[PDB]
């Protein structure tokens, strides 16, 4: 079981030009260990379609070509100004990842809740995401 975490900040989130269906890609990161598998995070700031146009969509994607089958559990969450976890969403089981396969949450969080300054999820208009993954299978 390979465990790894990635913290990713999107500056000036409320100004992102990405429209519905378009994606903001994180830096490519690595689970390390023996395989050195490569992953990235993908955010749809205005969802993928009209069904989820009210939501931010968040997906974990396997970038590299795995030597064997890859199964992984994951958890996404937002860090407030105090650095505390909030609005977490996690997989209740492991999912199979082939190269280029994405798994995540089409409706991770409502845009209205995120941009409401009372919730403190965009200090200095920065969106900080925290991704925790457990690769169960190679």
């Amino acid at each position: 079981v390979v465990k790894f975490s990635y913290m990713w900040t999107i500056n000036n989130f409320s100004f992102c030009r990405e429209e519905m269906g378009e994606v903001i890609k994180s830096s490519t990161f690595s689970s390390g260990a023996n395989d050195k598998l490569k992953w990235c995070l993908r955010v749809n700031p205005k969802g993928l379609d009209e069904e989820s146009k009210d939501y931010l969509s968040l997906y974990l994607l396997l970038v590299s070509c795995p030597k064997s089958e890859v199964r992984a559990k994951f958890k996404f969450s937002i860090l407030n100004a105090k650095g505390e976890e909030t609005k977490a969403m996690e997989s209740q089981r492991a999912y199979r990842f082939v190269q280029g396969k994405d798994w995540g949450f089409k409706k991770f969080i409502r845009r209205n809740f995120l941009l409401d300054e009372a919730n403190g999820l965009l200090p200095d208009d920065k969106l900080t995401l925290f991704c925790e993954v457990s690769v169960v299978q190679d």
């Binding site: 993928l48 997906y59 997989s91 209740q92 396969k101 994405d102 798994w103 995540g104 949450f105």
Partner: peptide
Amino acid sequence: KADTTTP
């Protein structure tokens, strides 16, 4: 439940 954008 987690979802995907591909088959």
